[model samples]
Target: AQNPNCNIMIFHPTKEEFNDFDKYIAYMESQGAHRAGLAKIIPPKEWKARETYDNISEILIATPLQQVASGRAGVFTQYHKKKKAMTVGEYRHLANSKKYQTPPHQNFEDLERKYWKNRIYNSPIYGADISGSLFDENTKQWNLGHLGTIQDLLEKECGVVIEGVNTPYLYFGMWKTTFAWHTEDMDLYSINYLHLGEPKTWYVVPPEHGQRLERLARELFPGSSRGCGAFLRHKVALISPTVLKENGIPFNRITQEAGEFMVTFPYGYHAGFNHGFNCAEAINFATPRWIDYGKMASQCSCGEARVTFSMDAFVRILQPERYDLWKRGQD
Candidate 1:
């Protein structure tokens, strides 16, 4: 039976409150793992809510040019590749210039509606490698100061290193940008921070119902050959919370706002959309309790083993740290 309290927990914290990393981590753990919070972590001026669309384009185009100078930007039609990959900068240019426009003269609101309605260009600027990016540099200080350190501890203790995980990926989406239903790699946890833009609505199923949801998804869309069996190709099935309730499955919904963070727990199946135009940063991490489920998820998706860091390698590194802690405890 689904617990009635098993819903998305929302929080609003002041800038100072969010600065206390330890408290924030503790609060996240206490809030049923899958949580969402609005914080005053100010985004860069370029990404502010008041910034004009053209202003955002200038900033996005300039940033990627420096970091992902040669990185590929994918262009997909109906969620499938449409052409050869273009440079990240090149893709941004087209998107900013509205070269992928459908009617050529539609306003922003109409454009968004049409984009999702017809599933056009669907070329989101995705930057998975943030080594030299400004986003990385800015977040690095906050990460190390607060949640990042805790994540590192959890990774070490849980034997689930994320050194190789393509986390902190930048997602730049226009109207109708949809991410189909899927769980974090190895049933791990994920945190998505909406740097700026309109809210993105999320539909989530708890870990307990993930397998059942997968079965239901297969039943709804039989023999679909896109990625995971649970993943729908073009758009996620219209399985809203009320619909799931009628089917005796419990689910939750959250329209994550700008400057807010959404955390999805281990084995939790989630799907969502970009309300209009938005930029978000997402990354995956794990906790000690997820070890067994992580191994299971890895086996289930064995063909895509490269999606996350190696568990064996994680154990190899953790053993020494475990031994050191054990020795120190004896003293």
Candidate 2:
């Protein structure tokens, strides 16, 4: 018995290949046809949607994005230990001793507030809403529900599951072309959906190309690749409106439409641009897997690595005079 979800499906010239289709494959390979691109230009007549995908063989979840103060000093766990061992007054006494320090610019109170408002560690992640909302001053906080709806719909309709979201407001309008590229910190597949006018230009190179680009970036802009996975190489995918065919197929251009085909790439250095004087509408989403080793090592190296940004340290920095606020959350 075959598992409905476990079967592999590859696109071939004909469905008949299920029997002796491998024989025709020899002729097709001899012609050097495999060098073709992952997606074909849409024919003028086909206005319907199309999709392509690859499986990573497991399901990964999503988590919320948090904000924290920059430049904290103490280890996160040390604060926990002190709270557990002593009374609140005792904890405050130890904090006032000044054995530890925090970032120069902030005081203790500020850091504590920031941490309480936005610290989430080891959370079950979910896709975020990728929309113009990022630009809306009134809606500054990022929301995952909007992103979750689109993700759920795509997974059902396209037969693939995805797990993250990014802002499309950055990719739409006359400014779309003005945008530049930066590799994400994690390795995950993504789809940048343009819900509006066509983009002026779209260009993408493979992971190998990004590796070469990283070398150039490192030499030219030292430490520019810090935190960001710009140094990591992965497949690249791109989208735009001008790059489509009359049949509504994407030619050199990436088209914007309802249910348009999506382009898939593993992970790579990717960028998009807009050159013409036109407005565009769009949303961006991706499915990402947290880099396990990276997170594990980060947890181990937080304080010793000279990377000081923790809730305790931040609070100490903000209110050097009043360290009591650091323990307020516990009560």
Candidate 3:
């Protein structure tokens, strides 16, 4: 039989060809060995295809951008730092009380205030694993939150955190719009799967043009500075289907089952946005450790850091722990 990429003759196994363990092991070894033992296999015959597969599936989705902004702004710090720390009741009260209102697009400030008020109240009521609202029991068919249990299971099974930092920062806030273009620092990665409503779009830019991206972001959000500017507004990707085919990545468009997938986002620039339904994702911060970048004159490898002082400084002040978690992840 034909093996698409190779010319050698090989037997094409049927769906139930090897029900026996020894036969399965032999077959697996014959097909260019993989770690073999009693392994669970989802036979191709059992696969039922979905109508379409979103190239932009995410394992985690953060909540409303305003909540992200407020959380990033210091609401948590206000509750955490000052003498006579505010009780959750006070915090909840402040979060719910509205200041003013106006038209949707025009009322940026009041809307923002109202947003923070709601987030503070809702966040605590919902519990710290905030992504629960979007991906819990009712939504699991479409929304796939970060798998904490999978992280724990992987850690137990393999003696490693699947991909390190599985129990990082937990889901915090997010910046809405086309945020997260290019890529993220720390060893970043993501898994794509089926989403319920409108499919999200993502831009994956190459690492070589890192400097150009910085300049472009500066031009787009003038006077806003780095971390603060909306760099995720643009589209960029290092690999598209055309690129993948050209580079021999051997990709197939396949529908996802109701389960978790794994992806590593480190060392690449990628960004995404939701088109129809509002997007949500889970984020966890990496453990912190000091670093010395040595004598290499490197352009900023961490895109978020380039604007940390200008735009993100305020964001950091609100969610200090989360901010610091991000900082540590990137380092």
Candidate 4:
């Protein structure tokens, strides 16, 4: 079942209010908007992220078998065995053109056998992330590096531009293509803006309910969990709201429209699927409280581990004025 209430609280802020990050965030959290894990903001009239991003030439595409859930409503397990590069025009033709549209599966048997048989076929890429060379030249507001509201306070102090985290990553999505449930890297805050296209459906569990959803996912995909205790962190787990309801976990539904911004809170669990063809630009930002979560994330040492942001480096760079001010008084 979908959320019982309306979508997450939507705010329309003035350009001034939007630029004042501290004030806006304080009021947002105070209003309990953080309880939803994600919030929608209608950007001020002055901010225009015009649709100049669709001209890119090549994108890495991976095709995965997606489950079109029947009435029983089970979860989906999507994995791509291989990947290849495809042009932006090619994806548009396949995703939106009548030629490549997948036929509808009306029942469980139809959907089940389709995936089983389709398993043998090769795939197309979904969720390709790369910097948009063609579109980045003109836009300053869309240039997250210049966006004052979503700027990273912690990383700015460190004076290091973390490529993917600091620089914006442009994402391309297609119908039924999904991103699995996961928090941001190191549990930092993330803001995404749709440049314009078909609306994307986002499902999120608030930070308070993050553990509940994780526990349920662990139970549902024991094999995945056995492969790694933190299986969801790999971004392979996709659970349906039916299961969430049955298991008594809370979730909020959001249909992200063109020009609107979706902001996911620190440690907030989120996942979504594209309604159709769309392009979005997103990047992570950090508040002061994010320091602790980054340290906690740094403690992960396991199979297939990737190096995370360096806590030692962050701390070393962060200690000057902070240490000096605190040294003046320990109380």
Model 1: per-residue Cα lDDT over 1-331, one tens digit each: 2223566666555555555544664565565544321112333333322223344333332232111111112112122223344444455454455633235435544544453344433444332223222243344323421244324755666655455333356666544456657776546667777766666777787676676776766665554435544243223343434445667766766677786667777777787556555677666655566566654552222132233344334433444434343233223
Give the range where candidate 4 is weakest over 10 consecutive residues by summed lDDT: 64-73
Q: lDDT of each model, Cα atoms only? A: 0.49, 0.28, 0.31, 0.62
Q: For model 1, give the RMSD to the true fold.
A: 9.4
Which lDDT value does model 4 have at 225?
Answer: 70
Clashing pairs in 4: 61-124, 61-125, 62-124, 62-125, 63-124
TM-score rank order: 4, 1, 3, 2
**Per-residue lDDT tens digits of candidate 3, residues 1-331?**
2123321122333446623423543464355322110111233343222333343233332321221222232112111111233333332233333421121433434433343334333222111232233334433121233333333433344354333233222222121222334443322233343223333334443333334545544653454445444333222211233333444433222111232221212323444332222223344211111011111112232334442222133224323445655455346
Error of 1 at 121 (Å): 12
Q: What's the ranking of the predictions by lDDT, best on top?
A: 4, 1, 3, 2
TM-score of each: 0.62, 0.32, 0.32, 0.73
Tens-digit lDDT track for model 4 on 7-92?
37788888777666657766777677766779998888987765564455455444323323222224656564434556666766
Better of 2 and 4 by TM-score: 4
TM-score of predicted structure 3: 0.32
TM-score winner between 3 and 4, please give it.
Answer: 4
lDDT of 2 at 240: 24
Best candidate, TM-score: 4
lDDT score for residue 131 of model 4: 55
